[PDB]
């Protein structure tokens, strides 16, 4: 016997996941989810997600663990290039687009999206950064689009030899192979810190 209050004020995971427009990888958006009951069962029981990897916590032990903050990051990346979304990984995305901490605790979501983000002529709304002076720190974003000083001749804001443009756009197209089709990605982060606990899993009675 156990009798807990009514279930109300559920977290808006539906609008985060079932959206239409996702930002590019170099300009991912972050949304703070807090002060609501978060039922992660509806996320797991869905068969739409091809990739569901959880680091530091079993997925079915989330409906009892009460955190304080949940962050959601959404972006679109290539097919054979989603393997870089994992702690301690190397590649263009990890180096210059989105860096995950080595001790990251959370879950990564990825499902194919060839039905919406592929134009027969070519979808060019999605860009990924190629160059930067140094590696991204864990959980920061770069928005500046200055000319990358490839060599030692100063660019002075004018594109030239060894003066390249850092942002290049994916040429998404339905004809592309499985390894080149777009893959929507959502990353959930869980924090514990000295504050009252707000988010919880549903408590069945």
């Amino acid at each position, epitope marked *: 016997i156990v009798r807990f209050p009514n279930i109300t004020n559920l977290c808006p995971f539906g609008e985060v996941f079932n959206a*239409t427009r996702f930002a590019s990888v170099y300009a991912w958006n972050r949304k703070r989810i807090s002060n609501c009951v978060a039922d992660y069962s509806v996320l797991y029981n869905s068969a739409s997600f091809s990739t569901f990897k959880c680091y530091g916590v079993s997925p079915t032990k989330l409906n009892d663990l009460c955190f304080t903050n949940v962050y959601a990051d959404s972006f679109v990346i290539r097919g054979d290039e989603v393997r870089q979304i994992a702690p301690g990984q190397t590649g263009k995305i990890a180096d210059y687009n989105y860096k995950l901490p080595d001790d990251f605790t959370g879950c990564v979501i990825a499902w194919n999206s060839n039905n919406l983000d592929s134009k*027969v002529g070519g979808n060019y709304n999605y860009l990924y950064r190629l160059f930067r002076k140094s590696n991204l720190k864990p959980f920061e974003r770069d928005i500046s689009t200055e000319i990358y000083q490839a060599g030692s001749t100063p660019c002075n804001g004018v594109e030239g030899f060894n003066c390249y443009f850092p942002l290049q756009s994916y040429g998404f197209q339905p004809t592309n192979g499985v390894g080149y089709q777009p893959y929507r990605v959502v990353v959930l982060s869980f924090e514990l810190l000295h504050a009252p606990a707000t988010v919880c899993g549903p408590k069945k009675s």
Partner: antibody, heavy 123, light 108 residues
Framework: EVQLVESGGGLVQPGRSLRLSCAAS????????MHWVRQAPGKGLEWVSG????????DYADSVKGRFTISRDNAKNSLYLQMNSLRAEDTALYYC????????????????WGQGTLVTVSS | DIQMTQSPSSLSASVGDRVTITCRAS??????LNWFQHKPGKAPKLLIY???SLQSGVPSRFSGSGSGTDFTLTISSLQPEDFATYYC??????????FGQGTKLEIK
């Protein structure tokens, strides 16, 4: 439960112009794409035109290029289709479909439709 | 280019049978086909998006299958409100959104 009501149909002489409108109220209109689908009086369906969520990419059917101009109004939750230089083979039935995605030429198909409006081209 | 065909044109069945309709394409489309239920008196409705994915809110009696070039729609129970004309559409080639011809379905 989404509503798509059309108007502007009737009868015009060949070579004249007429306009169509299609009002949407059951969903968020500012970030979906829409199309126009023609059904012949005694034949199958046929695509005509399409517009993006914002008026950037517009495509037309091969048989109606250079004659039809589709428009869109995000503020009033309505889209229009200006028909120009009508001939005798455009006496069909016109629907107002809704795209599942946000672009024009995607694998995603038409999700929600509306009742057709009847047009006639004869003297 | 691309061409789209409908093998059956008129079919007959009863309330307690099963009906399969096949749609054939001229070139490979890679599981990008859609099936529409067009009632003669109202606005046509979509049943299956993608090769074999069933849209929300429609009965599970309709079942689609097939990939590559040849596709097929299957109906299991044949409830007596299931009279309509069904079209198959491709959304993968350069000629945009090509519709196949009608497939009349009457019960007797």
């Amino acid at each position: 439960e989404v509503q798509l009501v059309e108007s502007g149909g009737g009868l015009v002489q060949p070579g004249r112009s007429l306009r169509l409108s299609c009002a949407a109220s059951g969903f968020t209109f500012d970030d979906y794409a829409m199309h126009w689908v023609r059904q012949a009086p005694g034949k199958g369906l046929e695509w005509v035109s399409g517009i993006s969520w914002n008026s950037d990419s517009i495509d037309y059917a091969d048989s109606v290029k250079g004659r039809f101009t589709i428009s869109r109004d995000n503020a009033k939750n309505s889209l229009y289709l200006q028909m120009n230089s009508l001939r005798a083979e455009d006496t069909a039935l016109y629907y107002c479909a809704k795209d599942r995605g946000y672009e024009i030429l995607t694998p995603a198909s038409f999700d929600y439709w509306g009742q057709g409006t009847l047009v006639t081209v004869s003297s | 280019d691309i061409q789209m065909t409908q093998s059956p044109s008129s079919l007959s069945a009863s309330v307690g049978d099963r009906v399969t309709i096949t749609c054939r394409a001229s070139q490979s489309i890679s599981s990008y086909l859609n099936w529409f239920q067009h009632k003669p008196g109202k606005a046509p409705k979509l049943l299956i998006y993608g090769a074999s994915s069933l849209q929300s809110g429609v009965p599970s009696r309709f079942s689609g299958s097939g990939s590559g070039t040849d596709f097929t729609l299957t109906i299991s129970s044949l409830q007596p409100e299931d009279f309509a004309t069904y079209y198959c559409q491709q959304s993968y080639s350069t000629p945009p959104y090509t519709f196949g011809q009608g497939t009349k379905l009457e019960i007797k």
